[PDB]
Amino acid sequence: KPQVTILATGGTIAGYSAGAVTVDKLLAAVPAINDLATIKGEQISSIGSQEMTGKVWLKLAKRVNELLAQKETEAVIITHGTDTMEETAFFLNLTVKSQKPVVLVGAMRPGSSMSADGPMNLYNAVNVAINKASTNKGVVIVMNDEIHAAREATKLNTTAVNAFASPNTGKIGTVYYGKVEYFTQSVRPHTLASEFDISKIEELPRVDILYAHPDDTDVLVNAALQAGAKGIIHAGMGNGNPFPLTQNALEKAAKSGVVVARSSRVGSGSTTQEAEVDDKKLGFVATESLNPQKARVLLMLALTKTSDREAIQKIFSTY
Amino acid sequence: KPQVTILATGGTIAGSYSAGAVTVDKLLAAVPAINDLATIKGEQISSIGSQEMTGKVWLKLAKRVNELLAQKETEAVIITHGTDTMEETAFFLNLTVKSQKPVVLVGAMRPGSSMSADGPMNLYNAVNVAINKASTNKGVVIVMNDEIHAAREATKLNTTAVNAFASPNTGKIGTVYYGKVEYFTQSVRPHTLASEFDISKIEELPRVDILYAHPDDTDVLVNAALQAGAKGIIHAGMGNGNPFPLTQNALEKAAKSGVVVARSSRVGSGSTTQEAEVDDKKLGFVATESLNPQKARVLLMLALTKTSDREAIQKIFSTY
Amino acid sequence: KPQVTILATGGTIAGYSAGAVTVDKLLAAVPAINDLATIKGEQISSIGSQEMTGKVWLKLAKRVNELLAQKETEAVIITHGTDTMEETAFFLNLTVKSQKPVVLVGAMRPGSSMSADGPMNLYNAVNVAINKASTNKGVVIVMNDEIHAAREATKLNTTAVNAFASPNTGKIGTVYYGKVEYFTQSVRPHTLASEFDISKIEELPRVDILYAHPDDTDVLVNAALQAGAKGIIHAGMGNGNPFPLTQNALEKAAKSGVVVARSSRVGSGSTTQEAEVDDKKLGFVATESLNPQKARVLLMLALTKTSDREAIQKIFSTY
Amino acid sequence: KPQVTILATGGTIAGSYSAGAVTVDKLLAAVPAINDLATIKGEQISSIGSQEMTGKVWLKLAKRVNELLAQKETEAVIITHGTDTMEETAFFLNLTVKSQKPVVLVGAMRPGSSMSADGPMNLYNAVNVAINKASTNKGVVIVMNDEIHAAREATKLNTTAVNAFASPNTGKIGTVYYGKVEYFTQSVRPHTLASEFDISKIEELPRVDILYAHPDDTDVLVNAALQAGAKGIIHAGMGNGNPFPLTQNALEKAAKSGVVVARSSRVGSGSTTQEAEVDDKKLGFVATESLNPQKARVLLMLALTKTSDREAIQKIFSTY
């Protein structure tokens, strides 16, 4: 049987020792997985996803690269809370240097809730990890019988069991009662094709996210920059447009060396280059086909190796 | 024919006798078909991009729509507006217009100069919706891409697509295909005449800030809004309105200091429920439920023109 | 406590005597509902939804009107299979003469499946039935924490727990862990405002559904008409367009007195009047904002009281 | 500049030196911008509405796209096609074109004469996608409403909207905004060069009927298709491909008689799985999995040009 390691980041999502007790619990909740793979488990952290920090990210990614280097460790499944699951998977996607499957799975309902999604999500995540076709697909998310590329996925609804979507593309595969089928695959660089390496990095650059609205202000740009932000993701109106006042504030901070990346509050689509705001002239970067919270993870990583407007924009037009 | 007034908030959404406003005059030439259906009056309320929208433009606009709609000769009011913030303007007027006559906001995802410009058709369909019988008492509506959306539900969800507008929580209330208007549903949430908000004597809207949550969040943005004098704050939290621990304490501090903290979600749809993870009652917050951060901000500025009481404000979010 | 009757149409969807044993089972699976309402239960039928017939429909609707006439019967919940659930609810919506809530609920996963949606769907359906706001909303469907108007709902996916959508509008309300919220309501005539009455009707008119495709045929029109169809729903290409050959066949059958209603295979949108095909001249009716399977239920009902092209078209432009 | 050939299957999707086809000539005048990007050749393969499409037009088209793509001077091939059946044509060529050079199908939801006609912009974006580097080896694609859709996944899902096209099971593979092409994904399912289907020596496609299931279903439509000589039948069943009992027995009879019965679903998305309610193996049916009834029909006519074997045909549905 394939050996797989489940890394728990908090509590149980679903209902001898795999290693972590949290993982032994899940294995009791779903005795089913044991006929599928040899499961070992570790407790990477003990938090809720809304408490996650860059430190936990580094910890995880580094631990994931270790596990994946071992010839007898076929894949790694990370049980994660849903709130920030898309940020962690995206990070890992640009930071894990392996062709082996890394599957993040979670649950919209407590395991103690009637009709808890967790058990089937776990059963399905495990079948995807050990599936020959998941190799080279990059980091993926398994929720509600669907398989999403980590670049494309976002949590679009607050409570629905089907809260995960890939607004710009769509899921890449499906897994129904453990049967896995892939129809597409990402074409943008991930994992072994990523230029970022976080072994040696211990702290990530500060990057704040600003939310645009009419009658906007300049004090939040100011406070982020005075608090030491290296980058600022501006979730702008429509096609990444800012209120004239905050634009002035964003132009001053870019001259002060803070990298200002224009995103959008909108929810989907690309925040294009050469639309209404002139980024070359003002010194901003356009985040293109990425939301504010994922554009931030990219900006943090970009900042660990550069701060040139042209080079960062190239990264956004690349990943 | 019915008399319709068109209030221009910026420039021509279609194309590149004087109705009253030059912009309106270029629209009428842009697509003449509109003249065979209504006697149009045009009026320039402001000349800006929707990203430059401000509370004062909002106040002037509403006050004007109310003067126009009191007139028997005026059947409807169409507002050409930029897309970026159309949803906030529409939502504001919806809790602020005291008439059941239709108030229609229309725009274009592409420049009038563009090839396959969407503005002409949206304008034409918009005149049809304004003069249709079934549009009365439906509240303020947005007409874009052959669809009719309720003001409370509409949001621009894509940066560039001609079909950028959606109502994620519900769906469009009707359709308009080459002038043919049909309604299939209607908002059961109070609006217009049934709204308790009256902007008549208001010169200024209170300041309400919106903060975007993420892992490794901070408390400096909360404090700045506080110092900058925010009367209220919308927190687009993680998942079901969840704050990062550090930023929750900062928020708790602002609520003690009298700033109204309303929890929303950066997620995009769904409700930021009560009785979820955060104890709002104990922390002194208010859950905005089925509203995105930006419309939750418009409801809060309004609420604040009347009350700062947490219970009342919660009730307002649970009603509108 | 409100009294409510659950009418079972087949087996258990979820996990003293309410009446039907199927209903006693559900009550054991979800002891929760018993603090909510006084439940009585009946077994209207013992079939899978793909076996449903017009006879079962009449039976149900007639039984529903009876129950709803009783002052102490607050609402009726019908546990139904998902395949044809939209056809039954639509029928009932135009046939139940009451202002009381009629809620259809089902399950995409077996109750014996891990993460079965049935228990929470039942818990939620019961909270909606007894909710003061569900009165006058017409017949509704409760699936996956959502409330759909019966006119608008369709099963859009074969396996997803979230397979129910209202493609043209959207759900009208939500029910999360029993908390119910309505945001919209239908504006098209239902229940007490419907002109149809099925007490006295014992058999419904035959109406076949044809599927359009390039290189289409005329033998299926022919066989439906020779088999005695009174109406034929043509699920056409795009905006209800037919292949020239089958159009000829459809024009001959309309002259032979079969009512031909143009719908679409497309999935959403209105199959408009005065688009590419001239219905007046050819004698067809345009089904407008309705799919093939729901346009068929309407045509059957229209046929119980008329067969004039103008009057039927008015019904399609009405309901 | 790159040389692109435009094959017109009907009329002008935009607008109301000779490229080679008059229609193509009107397109070039409709939007000149296209001439600054490629040297265009035009060609009228047929002049019909897409609802009149037939198997023979499909065969001629493919055979021609293959002659064109063998030529070194030909960089891509754009096919203007009516929307109604664009998805079947695209899917056919996708399992039938032996070249990795891009094959792009474009159309318009509105008449070229219409106000805010979508055809001009779609045409322009379509030329950009055909001449872009990343389009090679992506398979046949449809370009509509600023989006690039894989042929296997595309379907017209709304009767009138300019954004009628979607890929319900996956999503668009990329986007094209004012000529700027980006790809975010690609089909992992075999197409074009990797397809085992070769139409070169084929004069006719076998007859495959599609039946629509519903409660109180019948057996007379199954028998008629049988009598009419159907070689295969697509059954758009209820939910997960479920037939009404009566019609299942009729279908079982056709499978015994050598007609290939392939179970699909009228539902609209999802897969018509195996190991579901019907025992296909025992009944002799084939499950079409993640394919709608109409594309499942195109795959089956193809399969049938090679085999009638149930196992093989199932494998083909499980692969493409």
Side-chain angles (χ1 to χ4, degrees), chain D residues 126-175:
Chain D
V127 165
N128 284 291
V129 173
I131 63 165
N132 195 274
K133 192 182 175 182
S135 297
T136 300
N137 218 279
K138 283 294 192 300
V140 184
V141 299
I142 297 165
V143 176
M144 291 291 286
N145 192 39
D146 304 347
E147 300 175 4
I148 310 169
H149 290 276
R152 183 205 195 263
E153 307 298 323
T155 192
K156 184 181 184 174
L157 254 192
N158 182 275
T159 53
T160 62
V162 297
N163 52 291
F165 288 83
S167 300
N169 291 337
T170 63
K172 52 178 188 302
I173 62 181
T175 61

Coordinates of all heavy atoms in Angstrom, one line a residue, chain D residues 126-175:
Chain D
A126 N -10.6 36.4 -31.9 CA -10.4 35.1 -32.5 C -9.1 35.1 -33.3 O -8.5 34.0 -33.4 CB -11.7 34.7 -33.3
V127 N -8.9 36.1 -34.1 CA -7.7 36.2 -34.9 C -6.4 36.2 -34.0 O -5.5 35.4 -34.2 CB -7.7 37.4 -35.8 CG1 -6.3 37.7 -36.4 CG2 -8.7 37.2 -36.9
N128 N -6.5 36.9 -32.8 CA -5.4 36.9 -31.9 C -5.1 35.6 -31.3 O -3.9 35.3 -31.0 CB -5.7 37.9 -30.8 CG -5.5 39.4 -31.2 OD1 -4.4 39.8 -31.5 ND2 -6.6 40.0 -31.4
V129 N -6.1 34.8 -31.0 CA -6.0 33.5 -30.3 C -5.4 32.5 -31.4 O -4.5 31.8 -31.1 CB -7.4 32.9 -29.8 CG1 -7.2 31.5 -29.4 CG2 -7.9 33.8 -28.7
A130 N -5.8 32.7 -32.6 CA -5.3 31.8 -33.7 C -3.8 32.0 -34.0 O -3.1 31.1 -34.3 CB -6.0 32.0 -35.0
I131 N -3.4 33.3 -33.9 CA -1.9 33.6 -34.1 C -1.0 33.7 -32.9 O 0.2 34.0 -33.0 CB -1.8 35.0 -34.9 CG1 -2.3 36.2 -34.0 CG2 -2.3 35.0 -36.3 CD1 -1.8 37.6 -34.5
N132 N -1.6 33.3 -31.7 CA -0.8 33.3 -30.5 C -0.1 31.9 -30.4 O -0.6 30.9 -30.9 CB -1.6 33.6 -29.3 CG -0.8 33.9 -28.1 OD1 -0.4 33.0 -27.4 ND2 -0.7 35.2 -27.8
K133 N 1.1 32.0 -29.9 CA 2.1 30.9 -29.7 C 1.5 29.8 -28.8 O 1.5 28.7 -29.1 CB 3.3 31.6 -29.1 CG 4.6 30.7 -29.0 CD 5.7 31.6 -28.2 CE 7.0 30.9 -27.9 NZ 8.0 31.8 -27.2
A134 N 1.0 30.2 -27.6 CA 0.4 29.3 -26.6 C -0.8 28.5 -27.1 O -1.2 27.4 -26.5 CB 0.1 30.1 -25.4
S135 N -1.5 28.9 -28.2 CA -2.6 28.2 -28.7 C -2.3 26.9 -29.4 O -3.1 26.0 -29.5 CB -3.3 29.1 -29.8 OG -3.8 30.3 -29.1
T136 N -1.0 26.8 -29.8 CA -0.6 25.5 -30.4 C -0.8 24.4 -29.5 O -0.6 24.6 -28.3 CB 0.8 25.6 -30.9 OG1 1.0 26.6 -31.9 CG2 1.3 24.3 -31.6
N137 N -1.2 23.2 -30.0 CA -1.4 22.0 -29.2 C -2.5 22.0 -28.1 O -2.5 21.1 -27.2 CB -0.1 21.3 -28.7 CG -0.2 19.8 -28.7 OD1 -0.8 19.1 -27.8 ND2 0.3 19.2 -29.8
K138 N -3.3 23.1 -28.0 CA -4.4 23.2 -27.1 C -5.7 22.5 -27.6 O -6.6 22.3 -26.8 CB -4.7 24.7 -26.8 CG -3.8 25.5 -26.0 CD -3.8 25.0 -24.6 CE -3.1 26.0 -23.7 NZ -1.7 26.1 -24.2
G139 N -5.7 22.1 -28.8 CA -6.8 21.4 -29.4 C -7.7 22.5 -30.0 O -7.4 23.6 -30.1
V140 N -8.9 22.0 -30.5 CA -9.8 23.0 -31.1 C -10.5 23.8 -30.0 O -10.7 23.3 -28.9 CB -10.9 22.2 -32.0 CG1 -11.8 23.2 -32.6 CG2 -10.2 21.5 -33.1
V141 N -10.6 25.1 -30.2 CA -11.1 26.0 -29.2 C -12.3 26.9 -29.7 O -12.4 27.1 -30.9 CB -10.0 26.9 -28.5 CG1 -9.0 26.0 -27.8 CG2 -9.4 27.8 -29.5
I142 N -13.1 27.3 -28.7 CA -14.2 28.2 -29.1 C -13.8 29.6 -28.4 O -13.4 29.6 -27.3 CB -15.6 27.8 -28.7 CG1 -15.9 26.4 -29.3 CG2 -16.6 28.8 -29.0 CD1 -17.1 25.7 -28.7
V143 N -14.0 30.6 -29.2 CA -13.7 31.9 -28.6 C -15.0 32.8 -28.7 O -15.5 33.2 -29.7 CB -12.6 32.7 -29.4 CG1 -12.5 34.1 -28.8 CG2 -11.3 31.9 -29.2
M144 N -15.5 33.1 -27.5 CA -16.7 33.8 -27.4 C -16.7 34.7 -26.2 O -16.1 34.2 -25.1 CB -17.9 32.9 -27.3 CG -18.2 32.0 -28.6 SD -18.9 33.0 -29.9 CE -20.5 33.3 -29.3
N145 N -17.2 35.9 -26.2 CA -17.3 36.8 -25.0 C -16.0 36.8 -24.2 O -16.0 36.5 -23.1 CB -18.4 36.2 -24.1 CG -18.8 37.2 -23.0 OD1 -18.8 38.4 -23.2 ND2 -19.0 36.7 -21.8
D146 N -14.9 37.3 -24.9 CA -13.6 37.3 -24.2 C -13.1 36.0 -23.6 O -12.3 36.1 -22.6 CB -13.6 38.4 -23.1 CG -14.1 39.8 -23.7 OD1 -14.1 40.0 -24.9 OD2 -14.4 40.7 -22.8
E147 N -13.5 34.9 -24.0 CA -13.1 33.7 -23.3 C -12.7 32.6 -24.3 O -13.1 32.6 -25.4 CB -14.3 33.1 -22.5 CG -14.9 34.1 -21.4 CD -16.1 33.5 -20.7 OE1 -16.5 32.4 -21.0 OE2 -16.7 34.2 -19.9
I148 N -11.8 31.7 -23.8 CA -11.3 30.6 -24.7 C -11.8 29.3 -24.0 O -11.5 29.2 -22.8 CB -9.7 30.6 -24.9 CG1 -9.2 32.0 -25.2 CG2 -9.3 29.7 -26.0 CD1 -7.7 32.2 -25.2
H149 N -12.5 28.5 -24.7 CA -13.1 27.3 -24.2 C -12.6 26.1 -24.9 O -12.5 26.1 -26.2 CB -14.7 27.3 -24.3 CG -15.3 28.3 -23.3 ND1 -15.6 28.0 -22.0 CD2 -15.6 29.6 -23.5 CE1 -16.1 29.0 -21.4 NE2 -16.1 30.0 -22.3
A150 N -12.3 25.0 -24.2 CA -11.8 23.8 -24.9 C -13.0 23.1 -25.6 O -14.1 23.1 -25.0 CB -11.3 22.9 -23.8
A151 N -12.8 22.6 -26.7 CA -13.9 21.9 -27.5 C -14.6 20.8 -26.7 O -15.8 20.6 -26.8 CB -13.3 21.4 -28.8
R152 N -13.8 20.0 -26.0 CA -14.5 19.0 -25.3 C -15.4 19.5 -24.2 O -16.3 18.8 -23.7 CB -13.4 18.1 -24.6 CG -14.0 16.9 -23.9 CD -13.1 16.4 -22.7 NE -13.5 15.1 -22.4 CZ -14.3 14.8 -21.4 NH1 -14.8 15.8 -20.5 NH2 -14.8 13.5 -21.2
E153 N -15.2 20.7 -23.7 CA -15.9 21.2 -22.6 C -17.0 22.2 -22.8 O -17.8 22.4 -21.9 CB -15.0 21.8 -21.5 CG -13.9 20.8 -21.1 CD -14.3 19.6 -20.4 OE1 -15.3 19.6 -19.6 OE2 -13.7 18.5 -20.6
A154 N -16.9 22.8 -23.9 CA -17.9 23.9 -24.3 C -19.3 23.4 -24.6 O -19.6 22.3 -25.2 CB -17.3 24.6 -25.6
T155 N -20.3 24.3 -24.3 CA -21.7 24.0 -24.6 C -22.4 25.4 -24.6 O -22.0 26.3 -23.8 CB -22.3 23.1 -23.5 OG1 -23.6 22.7 -24.0 CG2 -22.5 23.7 -22.2
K156 N -23.4 25.6 -25.5 CA -24.2 26.8 -25.5 C -25.3 26.4 -24.4 O -26.0 25.4 -24.5 CB -24.9 27.0 -26.8 CG -25.7 28.2 -26.9 CD -26.4 28.4 -28.2 CE -27.1 29.7 -28.3 NZ -27.6 30.0 -29.6
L157 N -25.3 27.2 -23.3 CA -26.1 27.0 -22.1 C -27.3 28.0 -21.9 O -28.0 27.9 -20.9 CB -25.2 27.1 -20.9 CG -24.7 25.9 -20.0 CD1 -24.1 26.6 -18.8 CD2 -25.9 25.0 -19.6
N158 N -27.4 29.0 -22.7 CA -28.4 30.0 -22.6 C -28.8 30.3 -24.0 O -28.1 30.2 -24.9 CB -27.8 31.2 -21.9 CG -28.9 32.3 -21.7 OD1 -29.1 33.1 -22.5 ND2 -29.4 32.3 -20.5
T159 N -30.1 30.5 -24.2 CA -30.7 30.7 -25.6 C -30.3 32.1 -26.2 O -30.4 32.2 -27.4 CB -32.2 30.8 -25.5 OG1 -32.6 31.7 -24.5 CG2 -32.8 29.4 -25.2
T160 N -30.1 33.1 -25.4 CA -29.9 34.4 -26.0 C -28.7 35.3 -25.5 O -28.4 36.2 -26.2 CB -31.2 35.3 -25.7 OG1 -31.4 35.4 -24.3 CG2 -32.4 34.6 -26.3
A161 N -28.2 35.0 -24.3 CA -27.1 35.8 -23.7 C -25.9 35.8 -24.5 O -25.5 34.8 -25.1 CB -26.9 35.4 -22.3
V162 N -25.2 37.0 -24.6 CA -23.9 37.1 -25.3 C -22.8 36.2 -24.6 O -21.9 35.8 -25.3 CB -23.5 38.5 -25.4 CG1 -24.5 39.3 -26.3 CG2 -23.3 39.2 -24.0
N163 N -23.1 35.9 -23.4 CA -22.3 35.0 -22.6 C -22.9 33.6 -22.5 O -22.8 32.9 -21.4 CB -22.0 35.6 -21.2 CG -23.2 36.0 -20.5 OD1 -23.9 36.9 -20.9 ND2 -23.5 35.3 -19.4
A164 N -23.6 33.1 -23.6 CA -24.2 31.9 -23.6 C -23.3 30.7 -23.5 O -23.7 29.7 -22.9 CB -25.0 31.7 -24.9
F165 N -22.1 30.8 -24.0 CA -21.1 29.7 -23.9 C -20.4 29.5 -22.5 O -20.0 30.4 -21.9 CB -20.1 29.7 -25.0 CG -20.7 29.3 -26.3 CD1 -21.4 30.2 -27.1 CD2 -20.6 28.0 -26.8 CE1 -21.9 29.9 -28.3 CE2 -21.1 27.6 -28.0 CZ -21.8 28.6 -28.7
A166 N -20.4 28.2 -22.1 CA -19.7 27.9 -20.9 C -19.1 26.5 -21.0 O -19.1 25.9 -22.1 CB -20.7 27.9 -19.8
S167 N -18.4 26.0 -20.0 CA -17.8 24.7 -19.9 C -18.2 24.4 -18.5 O -17.3 24.5 -17.6 CB -16.2 24.8 -20.0 OG -15.8 25.4 -21.3
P168 N -19.4 23.9 -18.3 CA -20.0 23.6 -17.0 C -19.2 22.6 -16.1 O -19.1 22.9 -14.9 CB -21.3 23.0 -17.3 CG -21.3 22.7 -18.9 CD -20.5 23.9 -19.3
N169 N -18.5 21.7 -16.7 CA -17.7 20.7 -15.9 C -16.3 21.1 -15.4 O -15.8 20.7 -14.4 CB -17.6 19.4 -16.7 CG -18.9 18.7 -16.8 OD1 -19.8 18.9 -15.9 ND2 -19.2 17.9 -17.8
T170 N -15.7 22.0 -16.2 CA -14.4 22.6 -16.0 C -14.7 24.1 -16.0 O -15.4 24.7 -15.1 CB -13.4 22.1 -17.1 OG1 -13.8 22.6 -18.4 CG2 -13.3 20.6 -17.1
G171 N -14.1 24.8 -17.0 CA -14.3 26.3 -17.0 C -13.5 26.6 -18.2 O -13.1 25.7 -18.9
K172 N -13.5 27.9 -18.6 CA -12.7 28.3 -19.7 C -11.2 28.0 -19.5 O -10.7 27.9 -18.4 CB -12.9 29.8 -20.0 CG -12.6 30.7 -18.7 CD -12.8 32.2 -19.1 CE -12.3 33.1 -18.0 NZ -13.1 32.8 -16.7
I173 N -10.5 27.8 -20.6 CA -9.1 27.5 -20.5 C -8.2 28.8 -20.5 O -7.1 28.8 -20.0 CB -8.6 26.4 -21.5 CG1 -8.7 26.9 -22.9 CG2 -9.4 25.2 -21.3 CD1 -8.2 25.8 -24.0
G174 N -8.8 29.9 -21.0 CA -8.1 31.1 -21.0 C -9.0 32.2 -21.3 O -10.2 32.1 -21.3
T175 N -8.4 33.4 -21.6 CA -9.1 34.6 -21.8 C -8.4 35.4 -23.0 O -7.3 35.1 -23.3 CB -9.2 35.5 -20.6 OG1 -7.8 35.9 -20.2 CG2 -9.8 34.8 -19.4

